[PDB]
Design an enzyme around this catalytic site. Structure first.
Site, PDB file in Angstrom:
ATOM      1  N   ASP A  52       0.829  -1.189   0.000  1.00  0.00           N
ATOM      2  CA  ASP A  52       0.000   0.000   0.000  1.00  0.00           C
ATOM      3  C   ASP A  52       0.878   1.258   0.000  1.00  0.00           C
ATOM      4  OD1 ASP A  52      -2.924   1.012   0.735  1.00  0.00           O
ATOM      5  OD2 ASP A  52      -1.506   2.251   1.764  1.00  0.00           O
ATOM      6  N   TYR A  57       2.738  10.061  -0.642  1.00  0.00           N
ATOM      7  CA  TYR A  57       3.791   9.556   0.267  1.00  0.00           C
ATOM      8  C   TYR A  57       5.172   9.802  -0.316  1.00  0.00           C
ATOM      9  CZ  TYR A  57      -0.087   6.843   2.237  1.00  0.00           C
ATOM     10  OH  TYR A  57      -1.310   6.473   2.783  1.00  0.00           O
ATOM     11  N   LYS A  86      -3.019   5.779  -4.589  1.00  0.00           N
ATOM     12  CA  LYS A  86      -4.136   6.678  -4.207  1.00  0.00           C
ATOM     13  C   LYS A  86      -3.985   8.026  -4.866  1.00  0.00           C
ATOM     14  CE  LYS A  86      -3.995   4.643   0.483  1.00  0.00           C
ATOM     15  NZ  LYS A  86      -2.551   4.638   0.823  1.00  0.00           N
ATOM     16  N   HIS A 119      -8.026   9.074  -2.134  1.00  0.00           N
ATOM     17  CA  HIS A 119      -7.335   9.073  -0.863  1.00  0.00           C
ATOM     18  C   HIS A 119      -8.120   9.734   0.323  1.00  0.00           C
ATOM     19  CE1 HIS A 119      -2.950   9.220   0.775  1.00  0.00           C
ATOM     20  NE2 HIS A 119      -3.811   8.976   1.758  1.00  0.00           N
TER      21      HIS A 119
END
Ligand code: NAP
Ligand code: STR
Length: 325
Positions: A52, A57, A86, A119
């Protein structure tokens, strides 16, 4: 390894299979990215088949390289990796959804993601800033109909760029809005939300189950605890005395108890670690089982502690955490 060609999976509502233990890849800003590369390789090597990440990120280049490296060295096949990305909130406008996915894929150097999620349901202005602000330091929110976002997501699935589509941080009302959408083609396969024994999401979970939406638990070990995202005086989940007592009784750990709890209540569970030992340890979730009385004791820990309020996004109606669920 007696038989690593099989592993535990759940059937999603679109016919695809999701491994029930996922490797979380987010790390705080002070951690350099070479770390994500190695940790994902270790996870794969330990038996994680679900990974994930997310565009925000800022690790997808590293995560992609780890996946391709482990395919190229023969450890794993692409079809035995379930990779989630996401869509960040500055790309909710339907015209920007597919370019954001293509961009993730280009950083990954993969042809498809297994799962793409909205997200977070509060939209912000498009542009290079992930959190766009005005002259007074106020976030520039954007008015976007998420039904139109969802439709673009559907087209990504039809083009093959995402095998499955779902959402994250959606509440009951927002999930209903998508389920009742005119011309709905694909239900979300999942709702990835915060879930652990201090915030066990029973009401949201039952709603998801009634619609055959899988709930995917993040911060299932109590979160990364990174300020200002998480308050440093929130209680530390893994010091819970009931969890610690069950861990000692089972000769496991608090973390493993927290993870196993989620598996036994029908949740797919994520667990982030960049540590060799903890990575391997977390895969032990499949080596023991909790009794009904232990599951009841863990259910009793529920105490309304939400680590990730994400209240920087509070105000607009789509802010998900002001409703009861
Ligand atoms: N969709 C969203 O909004 C959202 C939000 C948050 C997270 N997520 C996803 O879900 C993932 C997990 O959530 P999270 O990052 O909040 O953290 P989390 O998994 O709840 O907790 C991980 C923390 O626990 C530690 N840990 C891991 N295994 C352990 C063990 N066996 N014993 C003791 N401690 C252990 C880790 O440290 P070490 O690393 O040092 O082991 C890390 O600091 C994320 O990385 C991300 O992929 C999604
Ligand atoms: C993983 C997680 O909990 C999410 C919730 C809010 C997200 C943050 C939103 C703000 C942000 C802006 C950046 O430029 C770096 C990424 C960060 C720092 C994000 C990291 C991912 C966060 C921290």
């Amino acid at each position: 390894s007696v038989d690593d060609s099989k592993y535990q999976c759940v059937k999603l509502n679109d016919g695809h299979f999701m491994p029930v233990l996922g490797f979380g890849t987010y790390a705080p800003a002070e951690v350099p990215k070479s770390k994500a590369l190695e940790a994902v390789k270790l996870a794969i090597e330990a038996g994680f088949h679900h990974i994930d990440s997310a565009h925000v990120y800022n690790n997808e280049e590293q995560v992609g390289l780890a996946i391709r490296s482990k395919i190229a060295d023969g450890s794993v096949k692409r079809e035995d990796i379930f990779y989630t990305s996401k869509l960040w909130s500055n790309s909710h406008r339907p015209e920007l959804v597919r370019p954001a996915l293509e961009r993730s894929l280009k950083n990954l150097q993969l042809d498809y993601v297994d799962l793409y999620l909205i997200h977070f349901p509060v939209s912000v202005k498009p542009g290079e800033e992930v959190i766009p602000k005005d002259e007074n330091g106020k976030i520039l929110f954007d008015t976007v109909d998420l039904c139109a976002t969802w439709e673009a997501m559907e087209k990504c699935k039809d083009a093959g760029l995402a095998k499955s589509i779902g959402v994250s941080n959606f509440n009951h009302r927002l999930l209903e809005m998508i389920l009742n959408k005119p011309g709905l083609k694909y239900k979300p396969v999942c709702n990835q939300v915060e879930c652990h024994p201090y915030f066990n999401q029973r009401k949201l979970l039952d709603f998801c189950k009634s619609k055959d939406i899988v709930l995917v638990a993040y911060s299932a070990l109590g979160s990364h605890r990174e300020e200002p995202w998480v308050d440093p005086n929130s209680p530390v989940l893994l010091e819970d005395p009931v969890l610690c007592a069950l861990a000692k009784k089972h000769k496991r750990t608090p973390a493993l108890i927290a993870l196993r709890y989620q598996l036994q209540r029908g949740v797919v569970v994520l667990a982030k670690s960049y540590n060799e030992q903890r990575i391997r340890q977390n895969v032990q979730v499949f080596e023991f089982q909790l009794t009904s009385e232990e599951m009841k004791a863990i259910d009793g820990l529920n105490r309304n502690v939400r680590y990730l309020t994400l209240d920087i996004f509070a105000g607009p109606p789509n802010y998900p955490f002001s409703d009861e669920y």
